[model samples]
Target: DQTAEIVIHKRIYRDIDPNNPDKDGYKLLSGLNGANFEVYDASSLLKPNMTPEAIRALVDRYQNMTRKQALKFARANLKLAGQGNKGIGLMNTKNDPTLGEDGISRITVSVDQQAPTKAYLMIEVAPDPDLERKSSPMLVVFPVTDPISGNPLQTIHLYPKNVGYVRDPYFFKFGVHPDGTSKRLAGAIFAIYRIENGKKLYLDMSPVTDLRNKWVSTTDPLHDDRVNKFVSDQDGLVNTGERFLPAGEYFFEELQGVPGYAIKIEIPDSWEDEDGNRRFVLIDGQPMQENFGGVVTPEMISSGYPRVYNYA
Candidate 1:
């Protein structure tokens, strides 16, 4: 029989919450912290008298092995021993007292009864703060995976391709009254348009004759035509065909009326897959489509939008 046919149980650590002790929570321990570098055999897998230094050396050797290699070795050499299933289980800390004030953490391994195997001990550093920080929103597009075997995941590309972009806060402004006085009334107005093709456009619609009109004229030229047609037509039947508002210096007065507007179009979450189940990539919100161009109400473009002077 193979003497290397030994198995070991894996251990997990749970953190204790000072505020809420009843709630169960645990964090995996891979020895990232420089302290606690010893592994003991509670199941008597080691020799009768094993020193802490000896245990440390044994763990250190195992720690040097890659995770993939370690898993492969574990499956080959370790035996089920009919004690428990082949899969690893995380021990609950509710009854374990050795965990200390911070909480209880451990890993257990099982091997063949006749052969003894040394377990590897290692410390893995926590992920980088900068790399994991998520101040801005992010869209994680990944394929759905099988829960059982964890294989055969499939990726589906969207028709127009669902894409997302972050908009600057400066694109909208609030708190300007109609009388030119800063009013307490607060409302968001779209003042800038950023296209997917890297073009930036401004919209301004202040009522003031001098400074206000200057910005209005610069940001929106179609507003005037749209407003006139809406007024004359009286039925909102004015057909402003698809027009590309190229990036240039324009005033807001050109488009001079408060109408409904939308910006940063998002892909709707309801978008579906071939099975008619909501698409594998669950879109929390609709991504802004490039074809419609981000819409901005004339009021927001004029009054609420900020004044951005392009240096380039």
Candidate 2:
């Protein structure tokens, strides 16, 4: 006789507070996407390939296991399959509870199936033990819903389809350059966007060097003022949305005379999706921004400053 059963279990860690926690419980978060299984029947133990029915049977059995047992089983199976070890590490390397020691690992899992009968698996792994999570604030621009009837200039473009992805545009870093002085500056921010037909657009924001007229000043260093001055010339393009503002990852470089500080601004609730879903725009469970509690100095940048960016 064949029997089937489905079970669900919830496990809460004391160290992990649902209301206030240092890090989001990714172990529980993985379950939100479901789990994957390789079905095996005692009857078909010697079979090279198991049928869909056999797989489903195993999945049913797997689901019945408690979260702790399931995690343990998964870890054991992964190790047996030569995948190596796993564990959750601290977000900052310099901070306490660092996983710099050998044999540490992290695993993330997700599952999606078109049919209830079919099976699929998605797994993400973090290989580096010393690597820290970097977070950043993002701005998503939306269309003005209300339109002015009197003036042609006041009328906003009501492109419904273009509203969603337009808010949080993507940006990337190219490389960094050194300023001859004690400080080193490099990296150009590029805007990445998708067009109507699914084609990608890239806008480079690197400064142009004019050496023909001896414009290069050996005594003067290229500061933010100089950089912003050059960037201001492209305001026409940036303001028109034809050229997007720096949208992606960036390192805050401290120039001479300016004090450096890491400021994490909270992403406004207004930036959320129309359905009030934060996951569609920001991190799933983590807060928008978190402050490190002090002014940032040049030493901080040089000593491996880390931030997290979640484009959920």
Candidate 3:
């Protein structure tokens, strides 16, 4: 009779206010009272201990799942004790005092009564302003918990993905029939390295590879030019495609530039627009639209799956 205790840790950002800098920040999510829940098992799951690196790795994997596939995994791999939906009575700061100041909350469930080899927790909160105000947040779920303390964790970082980059930020090609366009410009041997206060910590080193996070340009029936991913030429100079990635400071490098052309990257600063929404802020002599060939953002990704360098 294998058994386990599962604890849920909620991290909501500082500002719950809309459109402020702290907007969408990570803090404990509140008003989950009566939210629905389910549990399952996935073999070899990671525990939600205080390990930052390990948690991040798991997040990358989770975020990369397509909507359909993610839901499928939640159902197929979940080790549910019952066949129906389970109610989440609340997200509390009481069971875990440390979560109080951060406005986080928690709840614990006992497993092993169902004998799960590996456990997955599934939660869905219907929008009920009586329970929580504001728009409905993502119904976050994952496949791990602390075997020792019955706790599982995940973070919803709210720092804006609102950053943007010019197609060719700083350099220009001097010769060879300049590629004639931004969308049609050749590519660069781009690599991104994670940074902290200008210190390089991790090398991107490889393709992000996850389909949901990796948008490719292609045309098809139905919508006019269904192609969404970036296109690239053999020389990569007319290349257009970009990968959606997690939050972190990064430095992009052009390992190979087209012959006689200088290549590089820099996501310029942005500002709110006439609608109280956001837009890019480029310097003089910069690209016409600061957002052209720029970084991606959650809003950009959701309003519509953005093409490489194109964001909302």
For all predicted structures, in order, the TM-scores are 0.23, 0.21, 0.27
Better of 2 and 3 by lDDT: 3
Which candidate has the top score in lDDT?
3
Candidate 3: count of backbone clashes, pairs at least 3 residues apart or interchain? 31
Across 164-281, the per-residue lDDT of candidate 3 in tens digits comes to 1113222221123445443323543443334455554333223432111222222221132322223234322222234433322233434445444512233433335567765432
lDDT (tens digit, per residue) of candidate 1 on 41-71: 2223245355645655544445455544544
Task: Give Cα-based local distance difference scores for all models.
Answer: 0.26, 0.23, 0.33
lDDT of 2 by residue, 141-222 (tens): 1111223432212111110000111222211111222532232222222122222144322222343211000112222234
> In model 3, how large is the Cα lDDT of residue 300?
36
In angstroms, how far off is 137's CA in candidate 1?
A: 33
Question: For model 3, what is the alpha-carbon lDDT of residue 104?
Answer: 27
Which stretches of candidate 1 lie above 4 Å from their native place? 1-48, 85-173, 178-312
Runs in model 2 lying further than 4 Å from the true structure: 1-70, 76-78, 83-235, 239-270, 273-312
Q: Is candidate 1 or candidate 3 better by TM-score?
A: 3
**Candidate 1: deviation at residue 292, Å?**
34
